[PDB]
Amino acid sequence: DRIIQESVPGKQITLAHVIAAPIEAVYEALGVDHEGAIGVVSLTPNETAIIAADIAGAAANIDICFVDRFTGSVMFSGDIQSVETSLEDILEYFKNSLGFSTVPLTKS
Amino acid sequence: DRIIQESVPGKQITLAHVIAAPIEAVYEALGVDHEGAIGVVSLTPNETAIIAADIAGAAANIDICFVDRFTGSVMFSGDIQSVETSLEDILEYFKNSLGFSTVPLTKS
Amino acid sequence: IDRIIQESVPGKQITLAHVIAAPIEAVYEALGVDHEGAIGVVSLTPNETAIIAADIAGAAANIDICFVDRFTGSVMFSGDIQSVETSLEDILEYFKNSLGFSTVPLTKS
């Protein structure tokens, strides 16, 4: 029961989430402004975080908190509709123009 | 015996635990006040730690010790019923609204 | 040479439950601990369970936690060989019976 597996990254968005009103401990632990909804994206390969941050900014009026190409994460802040618009555009671009597996937009 | 594996993160909570009465060494090696129960959460993708910390704080009177989006871990302190309430709300949101695989609430 | 998507999540297991009855001086210096006593070494997955295992180990005889590493899923402790074995036995018993984790036997060196 031993097998060689050549490990490469898959192509998927695992999380596309909006936190409508984060608690103060979340703004503090994130080092961000204590206002606005939070957009959280999880992507593979990790390098696609730069593409998703570009789409998020181009889609709506948002403030990029971080573009992490080392963990494949993107965080941004703004009004709840601006944050949803960026998440929607990220999911639409990665599914329709990149052929990535995508999850639905989740809200909390 | 050789296969290419496209690696992506799964969606699951692997640990939702309460340590009812931690030992002074555990309080010390964590940089916390030497009183109250400890809530420990393990999540995948690692980005979901921010969501779980938000739900924990909104559910009950907790003190977030850390929100680690790099390791997908959350740790908080409070009374044993407050800590259990936050763990219960984390598990019920991730199962019912996110479709994540969840473990039961464990106590030590 | 086919291709398969693998959703990676951590498994639930203790991979090492070990006691070193009398470590050599170089082991104590690399660790940076008191130059006396047996060494308890635990390897756990998920890595967050290191805090739980430290608690349960500390819930038994004269233990000195050398480190609780939630980043690597490791726990180290120094005490008398029977105190160290007791801690290791309790960790294995709790994780198997109350957590449903796969466990290895207590090993001695």
Add this chain to the structure above:
Amino acid sequence: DRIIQESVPGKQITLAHVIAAPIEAVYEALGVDHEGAIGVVSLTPNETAIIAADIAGAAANIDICFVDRFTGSVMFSGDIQSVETSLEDILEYFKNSLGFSTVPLTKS
């Protein structure tokens, strides 16, 4: 089911992308000159980033932003056709002379 998996890296380019006109927060978050298109490459094994950066520079007159052998990533800037030429040459060399699995050139 329980199986031993000998983990070795696979041989593939997972992302060969051009961001035609990045937003100012992308230039800022990258620490690069606020001008030109952005080329983004994801490779496995991570060591092949040095080979791809050498081919990118030899192919067109780009400006290498980073060659990351720790993450297997390459980022470069230049005119959109120079960036597309470098990406095309990287894909061509890796497929035809290295036997690596390659993705198509993507644009955003």
Add this chain to the structure above:
Amino acid sequence: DRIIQESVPGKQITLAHVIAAPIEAVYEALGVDHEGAIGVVSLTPNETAIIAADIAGAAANIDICFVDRFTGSVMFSGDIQSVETSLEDILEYFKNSLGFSTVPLTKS
């Protein structure tokens, strides 16, 4: 072709090697004394590096260069027969008393 895989570390020694007479660049890159043979061990789980360093010291007259519990590596120096003795004792203990998969002693 999509599967959830619960990842845990396997139990094995992947390398038990002696470099009889290393070149000066190898002593330089390792930050070690420019004298003696080099013993190199690769182990999984990474925590077993402390066990293997204990056996290596107890088995023969060696000078531990590093005990890396973060990478699962052990490096030691000494006369070629002392280094071989330590490697042999590490392999014998891990196979017979731990049930780990082992490789043979290799020399260069």
Add this chain to the structure above:
Amino acid sequence: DRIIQESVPGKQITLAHVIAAPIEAVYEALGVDHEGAIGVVSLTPNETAIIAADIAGAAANIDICFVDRFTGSVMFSGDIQSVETSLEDILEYFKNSLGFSTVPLTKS
């Protein structure tokens, strides 16, 4: 669709490459002397980087740029024939004396 995978490192050289004449941006991003060909090696387990650096130096007149036992990478510089000789000797030793899976010598 859930399987436990015991992860251990495989034994293979994934890249044995010579860049005959790197561009100045490559010498720069590497922090090396602006002269000579570049030898690039990718190995698993990561500890075998020390063995490969020793063989490279013993085989031909090369200057080790880095021996990375954390990433399993080796980089060296010298004349194109010295660099090819060292790559050939690493591939020969790892296949014939270690039983590692090897790739061919690639040139760019």
